[PDB]
Write a protein that binds this ligand. Sequence first.
Ligand SMILES: C[C@H](O)[C@H](O)[C@H]1CNc2nc(N)[nH]c(=O)c2N1
Ligand SMILES: C[C@H](O)[C@H](O)[C@H]1CNc2nc(N)[nH]c(=O)c2N1
Ligand SMILES: CC[C@H](C)[C@H](N)C(=O)O
Ligand SMILES: CC[C@H](C)[C@H](N)C(=O)O
Ligand SMILES: [Fe+2]
Ligand SMILES: [Fe+2]
Lengths: 370, 370
Amino acid sequence: SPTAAVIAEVDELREKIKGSRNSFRDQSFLDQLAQHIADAPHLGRQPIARALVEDLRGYASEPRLAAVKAHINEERDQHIFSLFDASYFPSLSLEYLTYETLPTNPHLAARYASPTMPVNIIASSKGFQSRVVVALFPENHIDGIQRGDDLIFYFINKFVERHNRITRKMIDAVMAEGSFPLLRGADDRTVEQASSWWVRLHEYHHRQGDMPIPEFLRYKKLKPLAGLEELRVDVSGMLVCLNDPELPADEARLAYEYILSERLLRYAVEGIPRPNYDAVASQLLFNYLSEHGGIELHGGVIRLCPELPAVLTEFLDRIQRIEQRIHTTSAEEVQQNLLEFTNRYTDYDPDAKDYRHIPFFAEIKERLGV
Amino acid sequence: SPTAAVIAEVDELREKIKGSRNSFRDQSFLDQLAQHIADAPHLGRQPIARALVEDLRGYASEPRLAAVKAHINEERDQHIFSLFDASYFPSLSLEYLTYETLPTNPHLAARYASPTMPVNIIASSKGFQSRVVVALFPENHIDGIQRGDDLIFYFINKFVERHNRITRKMIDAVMAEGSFPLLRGADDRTVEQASSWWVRLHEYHHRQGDMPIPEFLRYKKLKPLAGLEELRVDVSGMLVCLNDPELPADEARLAYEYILSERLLRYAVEGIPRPNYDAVASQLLFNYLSEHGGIELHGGVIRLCPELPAVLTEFLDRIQRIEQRIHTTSAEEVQQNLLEFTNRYTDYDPDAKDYRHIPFFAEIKERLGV
Ligand SMILES: C[C@H](O)[C@H](O)[C@H]1CNc2nc(N)[nH]c(=O)c2N1
Ligand SMILES: C[C@H](O)[C@H](O)[C@H]1CNc2nc(N)[nH]c(=O)c2N1
Ligand SMILES: CC[C@H](C)[C@H](N)C(=O)O
Ligand SMILES: CC[C@H](C)[C@H](N)C(=O)O
Ligand SMILES: [Fe+2]
Ligand SMILES: [Fe+2]
């Protein structure tokens, strides 16, 4: 396999530089790395490798990976190759992958446009094989730069895997019979499509509203607030799938079921021993929906009420009322009010200043090992 | 078994009351629970069950489980049975176990005395089978009360299990040849004796120093500070094993190796996606020892320096210098200085106000699945 030969070369260079992350911007190291990439029999031939070599060789004057990113962003081919430094994707150093794109609904791509690339990984170097690495953002490159039109990649094959391994099991164990009818027995190509809708809507809505990110990112990194912002955009996407009549009805209801099942179940159990940011927000959703009539618990089993669309709309309306006050108060004051809202519906420990898994999902974590 | 019949009856009542935690102090609920316990053909006739029934029936005027705790604290037999409400042990509701005590070193128990009970669980109800539940504290009972002479139980069999599942594989992969020779191939009884020394020294040293717990507990629940207090006491126990000549020399060195291996390795990888309280402090230890000459990294593997006992003494001295200022400054000022010390040697994200696994242990988590 030609691609296996290329990836073998990347993986061997990756091994050699594993102890040198502190030198990844040192020009002496970069010159040596660049020279080794250039001399790699198969890798060095590749246009994208020549671009990186040029970027690396010039880094002391221009600390940018402009040529590599121009290649990627223009989709000159379906390869990604660069030097990465992403603190939350620690497995990534010198990495390579080949991807395949997924079909997109024309109305979705036009009306909710963003530079998002839902793809399947065909082959990749070792750092990309970690289950941690589910996406790739422009600032993950060593230059740390992101522009609004840089392509952002989501590895949909990994979300399909997570849905099949975790979400399906949770639907069967936690939800009333018939809760997610379109998802039952749905094949991978179907979940793949719904997942691609989900990430497209996710990226689009992050940039909408009165406190979009990246503009207000540094106010939305505390665990509960990072989770709440995730939930704001995924509820927004849920409601688009319910309300936008220009989306194909069958595909939109599937995407709705998918986003709802992911946020109501899989994300709700994430994190050990404490909920991570996604789980805090998903437990907020669980308790809000329970309290406000969107779901019901009958003997430990979740029923989706027919009124759930109205309650999801009320929930998003409530978040938007809190954020709208950015126009008349400080971002710090809005933060405090977002936290107060979160804490009314989660298990916040004031002395630890952190959260506990609410008992409902703690028991599910125990029962299913999730 | 008669015991098997008792526990079956407990598990069945536990199932009946699973949805009712919000009523666990309601007298109408307690009157009914007490009656069902009293009528349990096997469980109801146990002396500890008579004690719980009396406590529960009297709870409206005496919100304490005094008769149950008197039975347990006086070790009238080796059964534990109560109604529990421990937010960090959410699996515990109505629970029952039988335990076996372990050999005890006379000097250790006299010089470092505490009401600690290192025991093995022989049989138990479902709540006690959770791997989360490694110990049982007096305030875990629904009355929420603790007294300085209440017995505190540690389930040593679970620490043996964790040692053999995580620590052993970590020693092999991460430690230089010959780092922990007394632990190599050690049988479960040997690990059990080391673990019982560890928990005894742990409980003892929590009450020593200038900021002991429980007195200063509410200042030591923030994740980094909770971990740093764990590490203060375990480094103290480490040094006791090295320095106290009236402890048996073979058992003392074994306990030293055990405690060091647990804090250097097993606790260092705890928590997903972020380190938990133990892991933050263990990564503080790792980086402190690296920079101050107590360990060295050669080929991704940790060598323990002969000078390590002196560097551990320096580390504990440093913690004790910060805590000593409680006598001239506020608890809050001490907290800030404990955090500043922690953050110098850990990966703190100031925008998230939380920690990331340091790269050394992130890589080990990926490689070994820990
Ligand atoms: C909101 C929360 O901080 C969450 O992790 C954000 C972070 N930054 C992001 N940036 C982009 N482009 N897309 C995303 O989905 C997110 N997720
Ligand atoms: C230090 C940190 O708070 C840790 O979780 C403390 C908490 N309270 C405790 N209380 C007792 N009796 N024994 C312990 O070991 C601890 N651990
Ligand atoms: C919804 C955005 C991403 C995919 C999600 N927070 C995750 O880490 O899986
Ligand atoms: C040594 C204290 C306890 C055992 C440790 N923090 C744990 O949760 O395993
Ligand atoms: Fe996001
Ligand atoms: Fe402790």
